[PDB]
Amino acid sequence: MKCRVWSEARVYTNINKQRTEEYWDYENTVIDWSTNTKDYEIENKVGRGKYSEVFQGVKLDSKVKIVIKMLKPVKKKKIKREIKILTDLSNEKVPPTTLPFQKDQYYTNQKEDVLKFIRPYIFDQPHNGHANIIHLFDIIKDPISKTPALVFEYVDNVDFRILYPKLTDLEIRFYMFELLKALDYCHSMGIMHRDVKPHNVMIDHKNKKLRLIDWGLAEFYHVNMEYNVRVASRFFKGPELLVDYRMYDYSLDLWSFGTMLASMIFKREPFFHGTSNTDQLVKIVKVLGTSDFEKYLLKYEITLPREFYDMDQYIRKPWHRFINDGNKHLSGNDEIIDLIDNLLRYDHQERLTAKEAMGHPWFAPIREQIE
C-alpha cells in the first residue's frame, strides 16, 4: 500500500462490487480465438502505436470495411483485458447511461468534503454514449504466425493535426460532447480508459461520427485499488500519475480530456509539452502554479518522487494569458475558460465528472439541439 491518504471515485464508486468476477476478472477468461483468417482480406496500413500495427481490411462475407489491430507481444493478461473491456462495453444489453438518471446512485462517495465538489449543473438525461465506443467484431490468431489480432469496425479518420485546426467552435463543442458521452458510459460500466488523447479518438467528420478507440490500457475500477501509474501517454498524464498517487479513478480521464480541450481551444499542441516524464510535471506546474500544487500534495500526504526536487517555484498562469488573435474565435468567452479551469485541477476529486462537464454552460448550444 503506497498511498497515505486514501481516495475513492466521487461517482460510479461501487460498479465492480455490484458486478461480479464474470464481468471484471479478465485474467480468468479463456479467449476463443478464431482460427479462420480466410474470413478477412487485409489491405493497407492505417496506423500504428506502441502496442500494434493497424490495417484496414474487408470482411469477405459481408464486404463491410474493418480494421485489424495486429497486437505486439505483451503479457497474455493484457490481451485478455483489452478484449474483456471491449466485450463488456459492446455487449451490455441496456447501457446504464440510457436509463433515467438517479442522483443518489450517481454521487456515491458520501464524504462530506467530496460532496462540496457536486456542481450546480449536471447533464441529467439519458444519452447514447455507448454508441461512441468502438465495436469489436472478432478476435483472430493466425495458426502459423500466432499473432493475436482484434477486428473492429472501421472509422474514416483524419490525423488530428490536419483535422482539428479546421473545426469551428460549434464543431469542437459537438465532438467534445460526443467524447464526454463515451466517457460517461465507460465510467458507468466501472471502466477507466486511461489513455484519452487525439490518436485514440477516431472522427469521420463527414458523417459527424466519433469513436473512442484503444482500450488496451483501460482498467476496471475497484475501490481503493492501487494502479500502475505508468499508463496513459506523457502529454495527457494527470498529476496523480506523475507524483505516483496510485489510488486514482475515472477522473484521470477528465484531466486527459481537459488537456485535449485546452490544446484545441488555445491552439498549443500539445498543451503540456513535457520533454520527459520529469519535465511533464514541470510543464503542468508552470501553468497551474506551485501554490495549489503544494496544497494538493499536503491534502493526500504525497511523498513527492525524488526526480521533482529540481523544480523551481512557479506562479500560476491565468488562463486568459493563453488567449491570442490566432485562437480568440475558440478561446474568447468566459464559458470555455471556466470549463477548462474545472477540468484541469491537481486534485482529481475537484475535477468535473463527465456528466457535470456535459451540463456545463459551454455545451448549451449542443444540448439545445438534442430535442
As annotated, the active-site residues are 195
Grid coordinates given for 6: 486514501
Binding residue (CB under 5 A) for Mn ion from 214, 249, 253, 350: 214
| Smallest distance, its own copies to C-beta of residue 162, A | 6
Pairing of strands 52-59, 136-141: unpaired
**How many other C-beta atoms can be found within 10 angstroms of the C-beta atom of residue 101?**
14
Binding residue (CB under 5 A) for Mn ion from 39, 47, 49, 327: 49
| Smallest distance, ligand GNP to C-beta of residue 79, A | 11
Pairing of strands 191-192, 209-212: unpaired
CB 123 within 8 A of CB 367: yes
- Pick the closer one to Mn ion by CB: 79 or 122: 79
Residue position matching grid coordinates 462530506: 112
Q: Say which entry of its own copies, Mn ion, ligand GNP, none residue 269 contacts (CB below 5 to 8 A, set by partner kind).
A: its own copies
Binders of ligand GNP among residues 198 to 217 (CB under 6 A) are: 199-200, 202, 213-214, 216
Binding residue (CB under 5 A) for Mn ion from 57, 148, 190, 216: 216
- Pick the closer one to Mn ion by CB: 183 or 302: 183
**Interacting residue ranges for its own copies, rule: CB under 8 A:** 44, 159, 161-162, 165, 267-269, 273, 286, 324-326
Annotated binding site for ATP: 46-54, 69
State how far the Cα of 178 lies from the Cα of 102, in Å rounded to an integer. 21
**How many other C-beta atoms can be found within 10 angstroms of the C-beta atom of residue 246?**
16
Q: Is 49 in the site for ligand GNP (CB under 6 A)?
A: yes
β-partners of residue 11 are 107
The window from 195-203, 221-229, 287-295, 348-356 that contacts ligand GNP (CB under 6 A) reads 195-203
Pairing of strands 40-49, 148-153: unpaired
Binding residue (CB under 6 A) for ligand GNP from 9, 46, 262, 285: 46
Alpha carbons within 13 A on the beta-carbon side of 326: 7
